[model samples]
Target: SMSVKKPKRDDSKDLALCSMILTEMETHEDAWPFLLPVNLKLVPGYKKVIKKPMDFSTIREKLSSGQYPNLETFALDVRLVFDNCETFNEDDSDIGRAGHNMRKYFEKKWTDTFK
Candidate 1:
């Protein structure tokens, strides 16, 4: 069998994106999957990687015709759509339940959607 090469990871804005999205999920209580690829370019080093070294753009062009080549990376990247919270009012592990909901939302999106 064969395996696929993985995409790079930048924990800065990428992770922030996930945190913010998750926070939004924690707030409203709905998982309305939306499109925000515009922010993808805002990710740190996304373009600099091009000017630094060579890019797999050509190779990817030959292989995958989709926007994201690696599903794991895509999944990981989408999780970054949410950033964080400075503090939460009241305790009792409410946020824990919120976190679980976010995970459930992610799982639902993964199983229900995606090709």
Candidate 2:
């Protein structure tokens, strides 16, 4: 049997990006309205790794391609965002339920409307 270790949480980076976005929204009120809350929240370790919002565009493009080389890494990044948002219970549960439900809902709607 094999086991895998999880990546360590890096709060310094998270807090930095959070502060940067809040500051940007404060100073650039006009831009605030256009900001996507979900996109902002989904930033992967932005505080330390990514100092600016534009840096995420590359990752977004890659994800949009729908051909990620490492699905585990993608899932881990998304999970990190969920964890930071306190979307899960303190016991670290509800890992896939919410995402599964939301994905199904969106997929069904897309299928009905687009197909």
Candidate 3:
């Protein structure tokens, strides 16, 4: 026997955190063009595996679309997107540097901003 999963609705806290993450990506190059909010710039013909680089927009849309069952899972999933990077995971990688910085934001980069 198996159980079906219930769709997770976005809650106030989830919505707030998701918005914060998206805003944080404003400085992340992978989420460019820096002046616009367009988040999903998938490579043409790219499949579901995220063969191309991505940014917070992907996470934002996913958050809004109920892709995750809860906020914790959503946050973790957002991280997985950056973790998917191949050579980008290397410290010397190019644009992935921004991804790392973005990850640091999730880790605690913004911790000192609030009293």
Candidate 4:
């Protein structure tokens, strides 16, 4: 006899919202640097300064694996991606500006979704 086995891991609306936001970011014009891990060879001293390197791809993988316990934790990593960018590049620089733009876009999306 096969008894019904319930999923111990809860289904979350937050996860869906996070995934949606991530998909939008992935398609955004200014999402280039945030898409993948920064190449250590091209950007020397990256690991030295950025203690916690976060990216869209890594976030996506973590999300898929249910690593983030909640939406706030998910958002933390999302913010970290751009936070690192600001620390690494000058505010007026191309990648830095892009990071700001993406940050703004993400905040607005987050607000619109929850606020």
Q: Using Cα atoms with residue i matched to residue i, what is each candidate's TM-score against the true structure?
A: 0.31, 0.25, 0.53, 0.87
Model 2, span 1-115: residue lDDT tens: 2577688554444333433433433343232222333354665554444333331233344455654454344434433443433432233335334434333443454344324
Task: Rank the candidate models, highest lDDT first.
Answer: 4, 3, 1, 2
- Please state the error at residue 33 of candidate 4 in Å: 1.1
Model 3, which residues run further than 4 Å from truth?
1-12, 27-54, 86-89, 109-115
Candidate 2 lDDT (Cα, 0 to 1):
0.39
**1 versus 3: better TM-score goes to:** 3
lDDT of each residue in 64-114, candidate 4, tens digit only: 998998888999999999899999999998998999999999999999987
Tens-place lDDT per residue, model 1, 1-115, is 2576677554445334433433444355433222222133665643443322211222233224445444556454334432120022122355434434555676665664333
Worst 10 residues of 2 by lDDT: 29-38
Q: How far does residue 3 in candidate 4 sit from its true spot (Å)?
A: 32
What TM-score would you give candidate 4 relative to the actual structure?
Answer: 0.87
Q: Name the lDDT value of residue 47 in candidate 4.
A: 78
Point to the candidate with the largest lDDT: 4
Give residue 91's error in model 2 in angstroms.
12
lDDT, candidate 1, residue 35? 23
Worst 10 residues of 3 by lDDT: 31-40
Worst 10 residues of 1 by lDDT: 82-91
Candidate 3: tens digits of C-alpha lDDT, residues 9-81: 5465756665675576655555542222223454442344455444455666766787777666765655665
